[PDB]
C-alpha cells in the first residue's frame, strides 16, 4: 500500500554501509555456500570446474557459516570490481580509491578474479545477487550490519525522496559517470525505465565483466533490440551475453545529473525520483 520495509542482518566484510551513503543500490550475495556443484555442471568439462571453489575460497580467505550468511554487495563494490575490465580509466580509479580507503582492496582483487572465473565456468554473476533495495538505515555494530533496505517497487525511493530535499536523503547516487549509461541520446520527454545490465564476452578479454545501469523509455521486451545493438561484443563466435533485470521506472526525465561529490573525489549522478520495480533477469543469447 505504497509502503514496505526490509531488514537483514549481514556482515561488514562486503558493502560496509557506514562508509557508504544513505543512497545505495544494495545487491544481494545469493548463495555463497553454493557453487562447487553447479559450477561443475552448466559448462563443458574443459572449463576447469574447480575454479569458483578456489577463487571464492580465496575470497572467503580475504574476508564456517556464521550467524549471518554472506550478503550485501553494494553497487559501490562492483564499480572497482570491473574497473580494470571496462575500457575506462581515471574515472574508475576514483571509486576504487573510495573503497581502498573507506571500505581493503584485497577483497576487490579476490572478487575480480571471481568475476572472470564466474563467466569462465559459465555460472554467471546474474542469477546471483538479486536486487535488495535502497538502504534507509544502517544500525551496524562492529561485525554486523542490520540494514533497513526497502524492496517492493515504487515507494522505496519516494519514501526516501519525499523527505529527501531537507538535509541529505537517499538521492540514489549512480556513483559513476562511466556507469549509468543514460540512453536515448536520440531521445525526448518521457518517463524512462531503469535496468541493471551485465554484458559478457567469452575469451575476448578473457570472460569480461561490465557492471552498469541503462536508462531508457524502452520496454524490457524492446530493450533486446537495443542491447543487440550498441555493442561490439557480438563476436563470441557460446552465447547468453547481455543480461538485464529491470530496476524500475524514473518518472522524471529532467532529474538526471552530473556531479563529483562523495565522501576522495568520486564522480557521481543524482537520480531524483525512482520507481524500484524490481523485475527479473532475462538472459538467453
Amino acid at each position: 500500500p505504497r509502503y514496505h520495509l526490509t531488514r537483514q542482518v549481514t556482515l561488514t566484510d562486503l558493502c560496509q554501509p557506514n562508509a557508504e551513503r544513505a543512497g545505495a543500490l544494495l545487491l544481494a550475495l545469493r548463495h555463497p555456500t553454493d557453487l562447487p556443484h553447479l559450477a561443475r555442471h552448466r559448462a563443458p568439462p574443459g572449463r576447469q570446474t574447480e575454479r569458483l571453489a578456489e577463487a571464492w575460497g580465496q575470497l572467503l580467505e580475504a574476508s564456517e557459516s556464521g550467524c549471518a550468511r554472506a550478503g550485501l554487495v553494494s553497487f559501490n563494490f562492483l564499480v572497482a570490481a570491473c574497473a580494470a575490465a571496462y575500457d575506462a580509466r581515471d574515472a574508475a580509479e576514483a571509486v576504487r580509491a573510495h573503497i581502498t580507503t573507506n571500505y581493503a582492496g584485497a577483497r576487490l582483487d579476490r572478487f575480480s578474479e571471481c568475476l572472470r572465473a564466474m563467466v569462465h565456468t559459465h555460472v554467471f554473476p546474474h542469477e546471483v545477487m538479486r536486487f535488495f533495495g535502497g538502504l534507509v538505515s544502517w544500525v551496524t555494530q562492529d561485525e554486523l550490519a542490520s540494514v533497513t533496505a526497502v524492496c517492493s517497487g515504487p515507494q522505496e525511493a519516494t519514501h526516501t525522496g519525499h523527505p529527501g530535499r531537507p538535509r541529505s536523503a537517499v538521492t540514489i547516487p549512480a556513483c559513476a559517470f562511466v556507469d549509468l549509461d543514460a540512453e536515448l541520446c536520440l531521445g525526448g520527454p518521457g518517463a524512462a525505465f531503469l535496468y541493471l545490465v551485465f554484458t559478457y564476452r567469452q575469451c575476448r578479454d578473457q570472460e569480461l565483466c561490465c557492471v552498469y545501469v541503462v536508462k531508457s523509455q524502452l520496454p524490457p521486451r524492446g530493450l533486446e533490440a537495443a542491447l543487440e545493438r550498441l555493442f561490439g561484443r557480438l563476436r563470441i563466435t557460446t552465447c547468453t551475453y547481455a543480461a538485464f533485470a529491470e530496476l524500475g521506472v524514473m518518472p522524471d526525465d529532467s532529474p538526471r545529473c552530473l556531479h563529483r561529490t562523495e565522501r576522495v573525489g568520486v564522480p557521481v549522478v543524482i537520480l531524483e525520483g525512482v520507481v524500484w520495480r524490481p523485475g527479473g533477469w532475462r538472459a538467453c543469447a
Binding site: 555442471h41 552448466r42 568439462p45 574443459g46 520527454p189 524502452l218 543469447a285
Partner: protein, 307 residues
C-alpha cells in the same frame, strides 16, 4: 494508474465527440509514457513510418515499441488512459472492451492483435481532424499465437512463389468451429525479413550439443502412435515428423555434463518463447468478480495483471 491525458485538439464535430463516447474500454497505443499527450501521436498517421504505412506484420513491429494503454474515462477534451505496461497496479481493476468475434474465458491471458479479419475493420474516422484510429483486437493468447504463425508463413510464401499455382490457404482459422477469414492483401519485405530473421535465429539456439539425443527417439514415437491414443492425436496427420522417418553418437565430453538437461532449458529459453518475439507480450488476465465464467464478444471484462 499514472493517468495519461490525451488532448482533443480542435473544434469537434458532433458525431466526432460521440466517436470517443463508444471507445471507453478500448486500447490506446501511445509511444511514450506521458502525463500529457496530443491525439495525433496516437493515431494511425503516427503508425506511418517513412513513406509507407506498415503492413499487418509491421503494425506489430510498430506495436512492439509502443506502449498499450486503456481508455478509462471519456471527456470531450481529454481521454484519460491507463498504461497497462506500467499503470496496471490497481485495486481498481481497469476494464477492457472485447472487440472481436470471440468469447474469451474467465482467466485466459489476453494479448493484442491488429485488425486482420474481414468484418472487424474498427478504423474510426474523425472529420474535424483527419485521423484514423485502428483499434487493436484483444484476443486470447492461444488464439493470438495461432494468428501470427499464419501471417509469417504466408509472408515466406511471398518470398519464393517450384510447385504450380495451387497452394493451400493459410487463410482459415478455427476456434471452437467458426471458420474465420483473414485479410491477405500485401506483404512488405522488411516487415517479413525482421520477423523472418528472429524465427530462424531462435530455432538455431534451440539446438545444443545434447539436442541430437532427442532425435534418437523418432522411431520410439511412431511405435507409440500405433498403440496409444494420446500419442496418435499428438503426432498429427499433417506432421513433418511422420514424414521424417522416411544417431546416438556417444562422443561424450567428460561423460558427466548433463546432456539432456541443457538441451531442454535452451530449447525452453529460445524456441519455447516464440510468442514473445513474434507478437506482443501478454499482460491482460480476465478477472470477473460476480462469477461470470465467460466474456461475450462485445462485453466488458475486469482486468488484472500478468499471466
Amino acid at each position: 494508474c499514472f493517468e495519461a491525458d490525451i488532448a482533443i485538439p480542435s473544434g469537434i464535430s458532433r458525431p466526432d465527440a460521440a466517436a470517443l463516447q463508444r471507445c471507453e474500454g478500448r486500447v490506446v497505443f501511445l509511444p511514450t509514457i506521458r502525463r500529457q499527450l496530443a491525439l495525433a501521436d496516437v493515431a494511425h498517421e503516427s503508425f506511418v513510418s517513412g513513406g509507407v504505412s506498415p503492413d499487418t506484420l509491421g503494425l506489430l513491429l510498430a506495436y512492439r515499441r509502443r506502449f498499450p494503454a486503456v481508455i478509462t474515462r471519456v471527456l470531450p477534451t481529454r481521454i484519460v488512459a491507463c498504461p497497462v505496461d506500467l499503470g496496471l497496479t490497481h485495486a481498481g481493476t481497469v476494464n477492457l472492451r472485447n472487440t472481436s468475434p470471440v468469447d474469451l474465458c474467465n482467466g485466459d491471458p489476453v494479448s493484442l492483435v491488429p485488425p486482420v479479419f474481414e468484418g472487424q475493420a474498427t478504423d474510426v474516422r474523425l472529420e474535424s481532424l483527419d485521423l484514423t484510429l485502428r483499434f487493436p483486437v484483444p484476443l486470447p493468447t492461444p488464439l493470438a499465437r495461432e494468428i501470427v504463425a499464419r501471417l509469417v508463413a504466408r509472408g515466406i510464401r511471398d518470398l519464393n512463389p517450384r510447385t504450380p499455382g495451387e497452394l493451400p490457404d493459410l487463410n482459415v482459422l478455427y476456434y471452437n468451429g467458426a471458420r474465420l477469414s483473414l485479410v491477405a492483401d500485401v506483404q512488405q519485405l522488411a516487415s517479413v525479413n525482421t520477423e523472418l530473421r528472429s524465427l530462424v535465429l531462435n530455432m538455431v539456439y534451440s539446438i545444443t550439443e545434447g539436442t541430437t539425443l532427442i532425435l534418437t527417439l523418432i522411431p520410439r514415437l511412431l511405435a507409440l502412435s500405433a498403440q496409444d491414443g494420446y500419442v496418435n492425436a499428438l503426432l498429427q496427420m499433417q506432421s513433418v515428423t511422420r514424414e521424417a522417418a522416411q544417431a546416438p553418437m556417444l562422443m561424450q565430453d567428460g561423460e558427466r555434463r548433463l546432456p539432456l538437461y541443457e538441451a531442454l532449458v535452451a530449447w525452453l529459453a529460445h524456441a519455447g518463447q516464440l510468442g514473445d518475439i513474434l507478437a506482443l507480450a501478454p499482460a491482460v488476465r480476465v478477472c470477473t468478480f460476480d462469477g461470470a465464467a465467460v466474456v461475450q464478444s462485445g462485453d466488458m471484462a475486469p482486468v488484472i495483471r500478468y499471466p
